[PDB]
Each structure stands twice: as C-alpha cells, then as structure tokens.
Write a protein that binds this DNA or RNA. Sequence first.
RNA 1: CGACUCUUAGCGGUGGAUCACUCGGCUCGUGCGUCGAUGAAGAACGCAGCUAGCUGCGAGAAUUAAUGUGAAUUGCAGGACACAUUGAUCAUCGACACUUCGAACGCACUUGCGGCCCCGGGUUCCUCCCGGGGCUACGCCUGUCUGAGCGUCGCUU
RNA 2: CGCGACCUCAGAUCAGACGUGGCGACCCGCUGAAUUUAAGCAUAUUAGUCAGCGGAGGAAAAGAAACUAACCAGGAUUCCCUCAGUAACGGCGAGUGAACAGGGAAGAGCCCAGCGCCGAAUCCCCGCCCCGCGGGGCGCGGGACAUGUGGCGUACGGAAGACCCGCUCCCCGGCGCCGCUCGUGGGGGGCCCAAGUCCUUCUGAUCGAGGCCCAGCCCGUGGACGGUGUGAGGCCGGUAGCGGCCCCCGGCGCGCGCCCGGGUCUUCCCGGAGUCGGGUUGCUUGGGAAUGCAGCCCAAAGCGGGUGGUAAACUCCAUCUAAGGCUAAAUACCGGCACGAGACCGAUAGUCAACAAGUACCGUAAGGGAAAGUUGAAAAGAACUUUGAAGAGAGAGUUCAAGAGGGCGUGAAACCGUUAAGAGGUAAACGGGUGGGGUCCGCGCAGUCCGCCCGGAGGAUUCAACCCGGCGGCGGGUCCGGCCGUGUCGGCGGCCCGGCGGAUCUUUCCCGCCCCCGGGGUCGGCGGGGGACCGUCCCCCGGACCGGCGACCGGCCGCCGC
RNA 3: GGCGACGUCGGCUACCCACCCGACCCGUCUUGAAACACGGACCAAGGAGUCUAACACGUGCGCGAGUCGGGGGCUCGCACGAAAGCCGCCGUGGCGCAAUGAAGGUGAAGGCCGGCGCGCUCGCCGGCCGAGGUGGGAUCCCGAGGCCUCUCCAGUCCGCCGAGGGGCACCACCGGCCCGUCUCGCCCGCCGCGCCGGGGAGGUGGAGCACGAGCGCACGUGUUAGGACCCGAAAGAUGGU
RNA 4: GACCUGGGUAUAGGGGCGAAAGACUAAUCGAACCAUCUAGUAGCUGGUUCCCUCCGAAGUUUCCCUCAGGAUAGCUGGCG
RNA 5: GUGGAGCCGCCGCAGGUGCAGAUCUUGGUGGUAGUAGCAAAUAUUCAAACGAGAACUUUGAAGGCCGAAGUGGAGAAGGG
Lengths: 260, 134, 205
Amino acid sequence: SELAGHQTSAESWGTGRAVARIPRVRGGGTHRSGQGAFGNMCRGGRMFAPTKTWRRWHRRVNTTQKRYAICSALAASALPALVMSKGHRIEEVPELPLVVEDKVEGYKKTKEAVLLLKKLKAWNDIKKVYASQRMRAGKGKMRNRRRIQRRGPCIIYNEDNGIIKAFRNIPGITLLNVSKLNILKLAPGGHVGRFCIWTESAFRKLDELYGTWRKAASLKSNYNLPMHKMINTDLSRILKSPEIQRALRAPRKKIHRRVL
Amino acid sequence: MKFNPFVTSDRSKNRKRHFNAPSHIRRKIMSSPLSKELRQKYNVRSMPIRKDDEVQVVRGHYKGQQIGKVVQVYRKKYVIYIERVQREKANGTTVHVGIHPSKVVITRLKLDKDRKKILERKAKSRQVGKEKGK
Amino acid sequence: APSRNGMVLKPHFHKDWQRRVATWFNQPARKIRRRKARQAKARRIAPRPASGPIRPIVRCPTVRYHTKVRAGRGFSLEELRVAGIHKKVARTIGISVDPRRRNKSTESLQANVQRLKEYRSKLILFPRKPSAPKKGDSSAEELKLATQLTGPVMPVRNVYKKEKARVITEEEKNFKAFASLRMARANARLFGIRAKRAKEAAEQD
RNA sequence: CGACUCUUAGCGGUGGAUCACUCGGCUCGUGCGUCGAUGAAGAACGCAGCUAGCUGCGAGAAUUAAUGUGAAUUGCAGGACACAUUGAUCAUCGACACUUCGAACGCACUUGCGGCCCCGGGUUCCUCCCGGGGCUACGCCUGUCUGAGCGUCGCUU
RNA sequence: CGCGACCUCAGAUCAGACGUGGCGACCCGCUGAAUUUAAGCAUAUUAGUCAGCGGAGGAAAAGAAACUAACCAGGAUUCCCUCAGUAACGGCGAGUGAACAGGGAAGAGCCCAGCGCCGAAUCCCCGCCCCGCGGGGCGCGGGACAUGUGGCGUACGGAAGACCCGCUCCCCGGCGCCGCUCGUGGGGGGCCCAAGUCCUUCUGAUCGAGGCCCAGCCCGUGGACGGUGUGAGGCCGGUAGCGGCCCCCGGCGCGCGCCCGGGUCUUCCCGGAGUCGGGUUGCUUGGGAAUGCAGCCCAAAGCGGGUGGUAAACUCCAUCUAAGGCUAAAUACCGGCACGAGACCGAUAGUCAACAAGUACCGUAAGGGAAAGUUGAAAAGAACUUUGAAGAGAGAGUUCAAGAGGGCGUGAAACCGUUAAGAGGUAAACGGGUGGGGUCCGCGCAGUCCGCCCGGAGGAUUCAACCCGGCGGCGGGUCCGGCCGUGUCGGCGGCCCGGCGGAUCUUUCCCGCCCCCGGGGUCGGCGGGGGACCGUCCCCCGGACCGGCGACCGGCCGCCGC
RNA sequence: GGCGACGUCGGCUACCCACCCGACCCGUCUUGAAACACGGACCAAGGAGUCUAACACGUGCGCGAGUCGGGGGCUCGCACGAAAGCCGCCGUGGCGCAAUGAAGGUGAAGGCCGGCGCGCUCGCCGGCCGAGGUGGGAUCCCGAGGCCUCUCCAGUCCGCCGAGGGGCACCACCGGCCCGUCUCGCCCGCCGCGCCGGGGAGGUGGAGCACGAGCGCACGUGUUAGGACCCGAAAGAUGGU
RNA sequence: GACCUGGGUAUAGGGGCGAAAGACUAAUCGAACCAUCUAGUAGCUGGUUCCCUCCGAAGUUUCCCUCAGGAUAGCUGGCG
RNA sequence: GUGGAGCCGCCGCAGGUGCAGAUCUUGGUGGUAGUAGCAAAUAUUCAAACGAGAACUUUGAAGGCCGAAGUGGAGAAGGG
Ligand SMILES: [Mg+2]
Ligand SMILES: [Mg+2]
Ligand SMILES: [Mg+2]
Ligand SMILES: [Mg+2]
Ligand SMILES: [Mg+2]
Ligand SMILES: [Mg+2]
Ligand SMILES: [Mg+2]
Ligand SMILES: [Mg+2]
C-alpha cells in the first residue's frame, strides 16, 4: 500500500455537532469535503496494517533436509503404486526406472522425440496432458497466467547434446539435470512420485552422487545416504512370523453385549 | 515458449499495443491468407489486404463461394468492406456490414510495383528457411 | 508491561526506523551483475591472470590470529630489492607493491623473496613484436592453459609441520612446568619494583 | 358488500448490490542516467473546412522538410490517384522554424516610455519626421583603449 | 611647469568568454525543533532526525596514514558478514551505543610549494600562411603575461650531481583500410513452420467427433494476444550463432610527434604557522580528568612534532610525518527516460485520478479537491402507420435476445404499485403443541414386493463330468544352470599399466638452501616431489548360510481360458 | 388379519390463518438493565488483534559434541531460473562444548589394595581400576515351589511363583572436586633464593563439576518495541498566507 | 463635530492594533488561518465479524505520587 | 425460473479471512406527509389579440402606487 492512504488533510470535528469523531476532510465545494478520511472504515481510507515489503518472504531449509527430501522423491518414483496413484498412466510401460541409452541425449528434432515416447509407451501420459488444457478458475487469468495444465513425465540427463531442444516443445514435460536436481520438479504439489525417464549416464551418476550405505558420495563432500528406522516394513510378515505368534495370548472374540 | 526477455507476454499490454497501434503497424495486423491456388503460384502464406483485392469470406453469417472485391479498409475499426456483402437498414437504405480480414481468403491480388517486391521479399526468405535443413 | 520469568530486553526501535529500511531484493540481481563484471573483465584484459596480481605471505596481528597466514597487500620494497626487480617495473610484471610495509623479521622476509622468485620462474612475457629480452622462444608452447583461478600461487597454503614422535627423556619430563609460568609471570611485574629497591641500597653508602 | 391494515407469492417500478469483464494502479527488478542565457521548467494566448474539452502544435501554428514505409484519413464533406514522377497515410526524426511572459535582459511593467546604428521610401539630412532590421540586464575573467592620484620615483624647468 | 616609468584604482553597449534559473529519489555543507518516551518532569530520549537554507553529479563523498596495533605484527578509501546489542555513555534510570583484528566485494596510484639546477629553456592573444576534411595545431611574425618566478627534471617509498660498472634503442596519438566483436557490439526498419480439411452443434465458431500398420500436419516454433465462444496451425507474433538492409562504436598496418634507462660507491640536499599546542566557554560523541568541532585569549619547536583510549611528572620503546592537491572500481538511487515481471488490487478496491483528474468546484489567499468503467457479434440506434400541441404511447421492424432502446451486461435489498390468497377491537412479531386451508411434490390410484434355492407344466440350445490338444498363471523342491547378501580370508592380487583417506613411517631416495674446515661432514634441517605402512572400496579360486518382493529352464501338484 | 380408483392417498417446508400455554428490546458498561441509563429509522457494500525485530516455553523435523552458509564464490546465454544445485585450505564467524573473581587471574576424579615415616588429629611409593555412597525406583534376571488321560523313568514349552538379585530416568540425602573470600597452620620448589612461586585443613559465597545435548529450520501460545486491535482529544513545534 | 464616509497607504500571530470590552485581526481569537512533523499521547469512552464439543473463574494478599491503573501471590486452562 | 462465459471437488500452501451495533464510512430509500409551508413593504378589473392551452404574455380602457433624500434618469467599484 504504496506510501500510505494518508495524503489527505483532515481533522476530527471533535466537539458536538452530532457526527462521529472520525476525521473529516477539509474545505467545501466538492463532494469530498466533509467525509470520513483516513482510517480503516472510510471510502478512500487507509487499510488496516498496510502490507510492507519487508515481510519475511523467503524461508531457509538446512541442506541436509534438502538432500533428505530429494532422496525420498527418487525412491518413490520407482515404486509403481506411488507413481500411478499420482495419476501418470504407466500401465503399458516397462520397468519403472525407465532407462534409455545415452544416444537419446543427442536428438535435435521433436519428431524423434515423439516417436521415442510412443515406442516407450509413455505417449499415453502426454495424451493425458492434452486432456488438461483448461483455463484458470478465478481472477488469476488477468494476472497473466490463464491456462492450467497437468505436469507429465520428466526426462533427466547429463551432458546435453540437444535433448533440451528436442523435448521442450512437447507440452507438460520437464527436463532437469542429474547434477543439479530440484525437489520442486521431482514432487510437484508436495506429493511424491513423479514419473521420470532416466538416461544411462544420468542413471549411473546417482551411485556417485548420493552414495550407498557403504561408501559416501564422492561428488558431495560430506554426505551419505540416510539410515532407516525400519529394516523390515511388511508387518503382514512380522505379525505372521513364528517368533511373534508363539508369544501371543489368544484372541478374545466374544462380544458380551449389555444384559437386560 | 517465449524466450526473449525484451518482448511481453501479458494480457493488458498486448491488448494496449493492439488497439493503440500506429496506422502502418495496423496494416500488418490486418493481414489475410492467400488461397490454396494462389499460395502455390507465389509460395507465400499470407498478405496484408489492400483496397482492390478480390476476396471471399470463409466464416461468418455471409460465407461460401462469394468472390467479390473489397471496397474500403477501415483500419480504425480493423474492418474491410466488400462490395457485395451488404445489409438493409431500417430505413430501407443499404449499407456494408464489415468483417475482419482473418475471416477472409484472398483469391486474386492487385499487383502494383510495390506489391511485387513485398511478394518477392516474403518468398525469397522462405528458401532460406528450407536452406537451414542440412 | 513485564510478566513472569523472562528476559529484560532493549529493542532499539525507539527511532523512526521504517524510513531507513534496507531490503535485499536486488541481491541476486547484483550477484549476476558482478559475475558479468568479472567475466567481461576476464575476457577484456588478456591471458593475464584473473583476480589480479600476486599477493604476499602475511601473518595476522593480535594474539588471537597470529598463528595463521593471510594474503597481504603488496611486496614491501626491501623484498623487491633483494629479488632484484625495480619498484616501478614490478606492477606491470603482475606484482603488487605496498611501500609502507615493514620487514623486521628475517624468516618472513625470506619467505616472500622465495615466493617472488618462484613467481618469476613460472611467468612468461610477450614481446610486442618478437624482440624478447630476458626471454626466448615460443611462449612456453602457448602457456599450457589461458587464465588462472582465484590466486596465482594459491595465496594461503597455511602449512603445519610433521614433528613425528619423540622419547620422553629426562630434563623434559621434569622441569618446564606450571611453576615456570607462575614465576615468570610474577617476575614480569616485580621487575620494576625490585630494580627500585636496588637503587635504594645503591644510595645507601 | 366495499375500504383500510397486516403477512406471503406472482408481475411491475425505484435503486445499483453481486457476479463476469479490464487500454488502470501498485510492488519488485533491470538498463541508461539527458535541462538552461545558443533563452529552460512553468504560465498565458493562439492555431482545424465544419472543433468546446482533451491531446498535438506556434503566425510555416491539429504541423514543413528528410528518411523509412507503401494506399489511405474517416463524424460528414471536399480534393489531388497521381506511385516505370515526387508516394496517400503512418512512424522515425539528423534538416528548418519556434508568438507572449518567465533566470527574463533598454527602463518600467501601466501592450507604458525610450536611446543610438542601419535600411526602403517623405523635408533627397543635421536640430527628436512612417515602416522594417540590429543593439542596449547584472556580476565577472583575460586582453584592449581612455586617465585619475599633495602614491613611489626619474629626466627636467 | 611639462613629460616618462611603474604602483594603486576607475570607466566602456570595448574584442572574447563565463555565472544566474529549474529538478532535487540518491549525495555534500550548514541550521535545527516539538509531539513522544521516562507511567508526572527539567538532564536524557525523540534526534543531530522533520521542517528551513545552500551546492552538485550520474553517482556523490571519502581516498594513498601526523593509521591500527603491542606480536612471529599488519598497511589508502568505500561496501558487505561478523565483532555486538559488546566496550562504553546514562536522574548509571528509561534508554543509547562505536571501533580494531578476522572473512569477503573491489582493487591504483600519484602530483606540488619548498630546497638546488638549467641565459624564462614557459604561457596567452593577434596577423598571414605548410595544409586539410567534420577544426584543432607543433611551423613564421608581432602584442602582452611573467624574475614579487612560467617551464623541465624532483616528493620523504628519499632525491640530485659526479664517478665507475654492465644494457638498450622507445612510446604516443592522428590517417586509410583490412581481420575480428563470447552471448556471439549497439540502434533502426521490413521478412521467414504447419488444416481454415470431413461430419456436426450454433446468432456466430476457436465446440464435439474423425484422419490406415506411421500414428492427419508443423514443432530449436504447444508464449501471448487480436479474431461473432474456449485456436499449435486463419492472423500478428513467438523459435532459431534465421537471412538480407541502413547507420554507428572499441581495438592490426603507410605518414606526423616524441626518446638513455639500471646498478654500486662518493659528496651535497631534504619539506607546508595565527598552524600545532595550552587555557576557557559552547555544541556534539559510546569516548568516559574533555571523541570531534567552533569562538575568544595565549601562542611554538626543530634528535622536532603528533599518537600510544585515567589527569600529572620522570624514563624507555613503538609508530607516523600534520597545518597543500588529484584519483577509477566495488556502494546509493520512493525523481527522470525506457523496459520486464508478479501466490498483488479488481471500479466504496488499486494512485487523489482505468473516464475531457490535479479536472469541475470551494477559499481573498496559502491551499483543499471530487464524483464519473460495461448496449450489441455487427448500429443492424426502431423507417413506416396511427393518437396527441408535444413529451409520451399503440402497432410494425432489427436482433439469438429490446426480457440489450443511447449511464442501455447481470439487475439483489430497503421502499412502492397492482394481482391472487388468507386474516384483522387487547400494537406487531416470536417459542412450543396441534388443527384447518393453500402451493407443490411423490406414489397411482380396494393394482403392487424383490431377487435365492427346490419340486411342478411344457419350450428352446449347448457345455459340464470324463479325457486328449493348448498356451498361461499358483504353490512347494535339488538351488541343478544363472544369483546377490554378510562376517572369514587368501591370491599384496589390480598396489609399478588402483581409487581415496591419515597431525602413520622413512634424517640412506630426487630436486633450490641454512649449520664448519675449491671440495666435504647426515652435520641438524628447510620448500617440494617420490614409496612403504594403516584405514576404508574394485576382481579371481575355495568356503559359510539363505536363495530373502532378485529370477528364467526342467520335472511335480492342483487351477485356468482356448 | 382387515379396510380404500380418477379425486383421491401420503408429505413437509422462511406459505397463510386460527387457537391453548409460554413469552418485556437488542448491544452495552455494571453488585444490579424491560428500564424514566446510553447507542440503534431502514437496506446494501466497506469495516477492527496485522507485520517486522527480540526473547521465552511447548511441539514437529534434520544432523548430533558438534551444528549452521545466512555473506560471498562456481556452473552455455536460457521461459518457469530473483528458483534449484555445489564449495570445506569458503566454517571466518555465531551459538554450544566450563566455570568463577571488581580485577590481577585461576580453572572442575576418586576409591581400594600392600607397605612405610612418632601407620604422628598428617601423610608417602606401587598396583588395581574408576564418576562415590544411602534410601525409593518402571523394566529385566534368577527362582524353591505350583499347574497336565493309569503308575517309576525324559524332553521343549507356557501360566502361577514366596523370595532374592543387578538396578533406568528421576527425587531426597550424604560425601567429593573447581573459582571468590575467611580462619588456622606447616611444608616444598628454583631461568635465580624474594615485601618469590606452589601446597594444606576447616567454614562460607557462585547463574559450577560430578561421562556431554546442543545447533539449525518450522509452527503455536505469551510478553515487549514499533501507528501496534480500530476510532477519539484540550495541546506542542516548524514553515508559510 | 473628539463628526460621517470612499479610494490609496502602513502595521502580521506570543505579533499587530486598541477613548480598554481580553475588544478586533476575512461568519474563526484568553494566541488566527493553511500545510506538515502526525496514524502526536490517552491508567479514559465506544466497537471488536462462523459453528459445535470439553474444562472453568475472580473482585482477596503485599508493594507502588498507589485509590478508574499496574507488578505480586491465589483462583484457571492447556501440555505433559 | 432468469442470465450469457466461465467454474468447481479432493490433497497440501498462503491471507487485506465470516459483521447487527462503533452519535461507524459511503451510497440508497422510508415513516413523518401530500403535512409545515408558498402571509414585510395598500390593488387590481374588463375586453381584444396571439396562441393546443391565458388569474400571470402583449395591447387598450379603468382604478391605484412610487411622489423629485423616487419604485425616476446617469455613473464609480464589482460582474463579464
Ligand atoms: Mg468468484
Ligand atoms: Mg504489466
Ligand atoms: Mg457506484
Ligand atoms: Mg512530412
Ligand atoms: Mg528596431
Ligand atoms: Mg547532469
Ligand atoms: Mg440489556
Ligand atoms: Mg510553537
């Protein structure tokens, strides 16, 4: 609220005169001559607590949590239950960490791009992005963002040889580098499990970029991969294990309803 | 996608440059497509329409196989008037109902000395697009 | 206005501070304005090294920092005098000069003379047209690269010694103790008083 | 019976809420960072075929030339359509011109009163004779010309 | 008495220059409050801020130590992070409040008076020319300036001269043109992909459907906006080290112009005053027995002076050289000229102002200062008939729509008009409980049950069981072929044609040096490289378990569709 | 089990009307409001606990005796990208890991065993170790005995188990150690024998130690400073007409 | 007539001017008007916007230029 | 039913986040109410004309007023 809505000469009328004690504008003649001036009640007044440009707009995340979030965004992009429950049609597709060879990084024409997605059976996800060519609901249309669109698959690489140009005209796609990833791209909406197409030299660099649990990352100086609270997670197997059900009592499966 | 950081993308400002256009920019945005026959004889896609081109209307209330020349080009209202498509008033007087030149297909150009060079400039630049394909 | 167990505090906001406010919204914009002022300064000059001249080995002042080694300002004419180069020639050789600097130690003097001659032995000059005084053939076969990065001779390289392993002998496990700290500290302040009582027995006759 | 009153509902009126729209603000940022005595900012007055405002201009007045552009401007008229002249319109603008006040500059600010110099005609003109042109503010620097001093001194008488 | 020289000054519409005034977001110099806080109020705080005044510039100011420090010492200024809400100030209350190290951003240094030297070696103006474009000169000749001191070489980091010693011929601009320009230099104009295909809905389509096994077409172009409605392809555009055009810039190479530096020794030279400093009084500061500044008074020295954060005396040490000047960058920018963007506002909002807004209007004035967006896709803005003096109607007419008729999208409420229904002496309205009437909905109207199993009455088709053909899955097994997990090693294998890590070792390795008598001593090391050892990760044979959601083949069992 | 067709059956709402009973007009300060207390004719829209800084505690997350890039730097010229990514001889620095005193400064390990000096109210050498002791203390461990279709022989298991044991966090208590001061005292040391250093034993003062829990981010509540939930004076000051 | 009036002129805010009433100074005067500092301060008034569930007060202690207000203890809730 | 071009659900994120009052602000409309009022300075009447239309216009006749310090005839200031 630029300077202020306080560029008006106004005093309170003060005394009796049977008006409220809000300040009135001065002078006569014009309409705006005895009307309520500044203060958050008046036509033309100043808003309550006018917003300031020194609001704390930006947030910090410490880097071990940024790296934590990006390891959990990659492990969910391989589980087929989580990637399909975000909506990506991956019914016809083969093996979930899709890896095409490093020849695909040197395509320089989008006709080669589209038949790639057709022969990888991922074109029926792009065809789902064409179904979502909606326009925005609300007043965001006149703030120059009009067209809503689904996020589709993302293609991840290293050593660009024209891949950034071949795919970028296809709508709803994302291309990010394996050296500099982005949690805002790997998990749009904050929900995990975006469908991704890897390339070999990108898919192999992950071993030396986050490390296994034996050796640390070499391209990250003091980072290893986060340990687990749970080793075994299928408690339909822990609770049916012979060690557990030897020690349990017996199930108590009467009801004993209220007696009249 | 737009990549140039020196050209706009906002709704308020392309409209403002549309309706407040200079009158020589305004003949460029009132361009009309050539016919399928006549874009093959000249290998050029579209042209700015002038006063005496033969033309048919391809969409609207008045459309369909109606070759007939334009007679008046209102640039102020972005409207060409064509010598046959008309409308009787309440008075009994007949006037020209006006249409937008993107809803319109040129079927015979009017060549002068200058509309030769406007065609040859737009044609010679189209082999250069084909010469990029190596 | 105060309450239960809390902090007594002095916010310095008793002055009209909303006019004198500073927001860092142009700070990414100025980071890419001084990268482009480094890139268009690197390519503008030469194959001369980026980030400027050679800086000396310099030790910090003030007890807290006197165990570290810092990059300095110039080369302290005495060090230019021993190395053999002239004071007005030196700053187009790529060598920074600080004439107001003093050398009163010898080891830190000889360190930077060793540094300055090591620079001259890794430098190739270009004659304008190939006359080449103090200089010979093809320019070290085109000088193996173009331009260096953030320090020509790695200006800090703060190094520590080995001091591998010793044997706990006699006269070393037995003497240099806390009593040596307390007695040396006491004689530092009882020096002027004891030298006053000695005068009083010197005027005793 | 009718009328009045009251509450609902339909329709109609009054009024302009809501919703949808947006050639406008607002914030942030980038790039440059440029007035004036060679008359600025600002003000007044005037300018169009019909034209009050706004906008644009200065007696060359809703714009001239030039370049670029290539058939319009348009509320109605009128006019040259001429473009292998020069070519409408629009933009750019590097050429020209730019009334009166204003630091405002002959002096005053009362469209008041001059002074010299020159030019076209009237006394073929000095001594205050029509129109037109030029010049006439203050402070100050360098140089010039004029010359003041019982200032300092010389050569003299 | 006259004339001359100079020195102090006058005059001029003298020849030629300059300055004034505006803007003022940021910057510099001054000046300067009070509200407020202290729960009162004087000091303090607000605040050295607002208002006031004066100067600029695209930046300004500051800036090469009369500095910090107190130890192994740093080294102009400015900005940033820390120092630090710290030292300190304070009715020691409320409150206020720096710096030095350290890490960065950026980095650049110089000139003068003096003291000496050079025959004033210097500068300005006028006149004609060398010879010139777009005009400034080095050349020539006259008038001045100036010895009361122009110029050269010199600046405290020392300097000069004379020696002696070993080198070396340079730099600068101007002219013409060629060759580039890292986002691929700038400005300007005009150009560059692909459906308007078939069916269909509509007032009108940009809708909806469709294009063979080549995915209908283009895509380095699926930003945006305008088009009778939601458009990659109809149209501007956007993409692309797209192309061509016009003008302009920073830098190679012919002619001018300028041109002896360094080292060692010897001698000589070597510095800014009514300023420092002191007293006192004001203001200011965190600066406290006075941080800074200023007035008045007193007023220096030259192994001197300043500073060393508790007044003073004595003493030692450290450090700098003041009272003259210039200087880029990093930094600032709510004005200006252009731009670009937004988790911003959506016409009582957002600028006071989306509109003929700083406008109409108000006030003698300084000044105050509004309200006011929307027909339609296209005016196609209702010709004509008829009543009336006309406003105003009734027909007709346009249009998808006048239920869009010129402040016309949508058209709420309050309030009013009428119609329809009901009611009415304890003002009305309300809560609870029923009743009556009405609007309407659902069933459909003495016509309502639905599927399961079985035996009835016929009707019509074909599988099941069974077995064979067949591909496919489920489960268990030798884990047989392939398999990885974890301790145990070994081949020290790959260590020299293996990765990294170690404040492990090696004074016999390899490079430039210190400690003593041309040589040498491990004679103790220095700066660096090398190669052993340890810690962890890369294969091969054996061995250990499980063959774990890591699996294929064989056989087995029982399903499954054909 | 029974009853009923083209006008009847069921149904209720912001429909209307009637009756019987109940029922004063809201907001608001206040011991007390239907008040002869104040504000309110009606309708529409606008309209009041925000944001920044600091601190406190609670909670969520990451790492953990460490933690944190916030300021810079690097990465083709990229819409989104003012994002994200990385550095580590960029960790300087911040907070934490140590306290205490005005300061000079000083600065947190004990118990046992075996012996010896007058085993002298005092201590010394060597080993073993190692955060002392008491009372409570979840959990865990041991556990005689106890519980099964015929009797004597053996196995896993489970439930019951008096009692006993090692005892978490934590509380109370006792002892110990470090610093400041006090009292009483004797002994040792030497880059130099002194208006020198160090030690002892008792008592008190400290925001201490006694095997570390912090840091960064986010959210919530609270308090404060700012216009500070909104509106409100009588004033004071500066500059002008 | 110490008369009444026009126009010109002078005096400007802690100032003016007053045969004096604190009169007048542009409908404003026991200190004008205009803009700003300024959204000045208020222990004092008035207002403070959705629903349901669960728990549920106090007007007392001590100190204060304290008595229309706060700090403090009590009573309360939430987290454990 | 009107209307004519956009909109909503779920999972997270963010607020200029929900009104009955503030002698609230702005705009609108009621009851009062077809009411109060259209009452200072003596006064109008007849015919005709023009007109869709005459208590009010013009014309004519009458009766009256201002009564020369005017309700007359000219200016200054101010208006434009
Ligand atoms: Mg909405
Ligand atoms: Mg915009
Ligand atoms: Mg309105
Ligand atoms: Mg022209
Ligand atoms: Mg004249
Ligand atoms: Mg300027
Ligand atoms: Mg009440
Ligand atoms: Mg005052």
